């Protein structure tokens, strides 16, 4: 009875261990799978933000081009205002 | 003699017509002067208003450029939190591969 | 009699001076006409160039607005990847609290 | 000798188990700590992106205001161009 109980226990522990290591291997593999998917959703969010980064770099360059164009328009209007001021003052002298 | 009375009357006709012409000319000249004065003042007022509005627009574009720079700064810090996140998830990946 | 020769000579003096004045007036008038023509053509050319440049600037601002919208779309998708990341890290947090 | 070996083994397994559960509790706690820090770096990146979101909403509103202002400038220039065209044509008629 004693050695029968001890042999029965040893087989139970042997079965428990194999079931333990198999679950421990499944845990380590699912932690790998769920972490990878997280890593691209990390990296994809990074690359989509970097795309936006360089779009606003382009937007700032285009704002500077627009600013030069309006500055040239203003210089033409200053010239025109000068010429029209001379004509106004001439009419005032008549 | 007799032609002398036609001379005198021609002269008198001429002086009446010169006076009439002087009045007609002065009225026409003052109307064209007024019309030219009003058009000159309006063209100067218009070009000044247009010019002023453009100076306003340039101030607005200067502000927009400054705000784009702050937006750059804001999106830089967002990239930092994303890189550290990349980093620690990669730390967990490396440690998991080594079991 | 004798005054008649002063009359005739006065008339002759007057006709010479009227002819001189006609020439002087025609030259002055043509110069002021040319000056006014050139200034009018230049003012029209200037305001047309200014106006055209402003139409160019409006096209540029229409483009900038369109690009801001695409930037909105790009940053929306970035928020999606950040929310799902939020979501799965929260999934791991909840599961860890339950041990 | 037999029962001495079996008692010695039982004490070893008892000591191994307590050392196992203590390490298993330390593992579960560090996974909690490292995941939290990851979660704010997630959420802080989210809130800083949302801040940028509403800045560009403001930028688009300001672009529309600027567009109206330039459209009003253009209408003044059209008026001025009309008036100057009439003066040009008048000078051409002289």
Swiss-Prot record, chains B, C:
In the arteries, prelamin-A/C accumulation is not observed in young healthy vessels but is prevalent in medial vascular smooth muscle cells (VSMCs) from aged individuals and in atherosclerotic lesions, where it often colocalizes with senescent and degenerate VSMCs. Prelamin-A/C expression increases with age and disease. In normal aging, the accumulation of prelamin-A/C is caused in part by the down-regulation of ZMPSTE24/FACE1 in response to oxidative stress. There is a cross-link at residues 22, 32, 73 (Glycyl lysine isopeptide (Lys-Gly) (interchain with G-Cter in SUMO2)). It comes from the Eukaryota. The record marks 87 as: Stutter. The modification N6-acetyllysine is found at residues 22, 27, 32, 73, 78. It is found in: Nucleus lamina; Nucleus envelope; Nucleus, Nucleoplasm; Nucleus matrix. The record marks 28, 92 as: Heptad change of phase. Residues 21-93 are annotated as: Necessary and sufficient for the interaction with IFFO1. The modification Phosphoserine is found at residues 39, 44, 63, 69. Residues 6-99 are annotated as: Coil 2. Proteolytic cleavage of the C-terminal of 18 residues of prelamin-A/C results in the production of lamin-A/C. The prelamin-A/C maturation pathway includes farnesylation of CAAX motif by protein farnesyltransferase (FNTA and FNTB), removal of the last three amino acids (-AAX) by RCE1/FACE2 and/or ZMPSTE24, methylation of the C-terminal cysteine by ICMT and endoproteolytic removal of the last 15 C-terminal amino acids by ZMPSTE24. Proteolytic cleavage requires prior farnesylation and methylation, and absence of these blocks cleavage. Farnesylation of prelamin-A/C facilitates nuclear envelope targeting. Homodimer of lamin A and lamin C. Lamin dimers then assemble into dimeric head-to-tail polymers. Ultimately, two head-to-tail polymers assemble laterally into a protofilament with a uniformly shaped rod of 3.5 nm in diameter. Interacts with lamin-associated polypeptides IA, IB and TMPO-alpha, RB1 and with emerin. Interacts with SREBF1, SREBF2, SUN2 and TMEM43. Interacts with TMEM201. Proteolytically processed isoform A interacts with NARF. Interacts with SUN1. Interacts with MLIP. Interacts with DMPK; may regulate nuclear envelope stability. Belongs to the intermediate filament family. It is linked to Emery-Dreifuss muscular dystrophy 2, autosomal dominant: A form of Emery-Dreifuss muscular dystrophy, a degenerative myopathy characterized by weakness and atrophy of muscle without involvement of the nervous system, early contractures of the elbows, Achilles tendons and spine, and cardiomyopathy associated with cardiac conduction defects. Emery-Dreifuss muscular dystrophy 3, autosomal recessive: A form of Emery-Dreifuss muscular dystrophy, a degenerative myopathy characterized by weakness and atrophy of muscle without involvement of the nervous system, early contractures of the elbows, Achilles tendons and spine, and cardiomyopathy associated with cardiac conduction defects. This is Prelamin-A/C. It comes from Homo sapiens. The gene is LMNA.
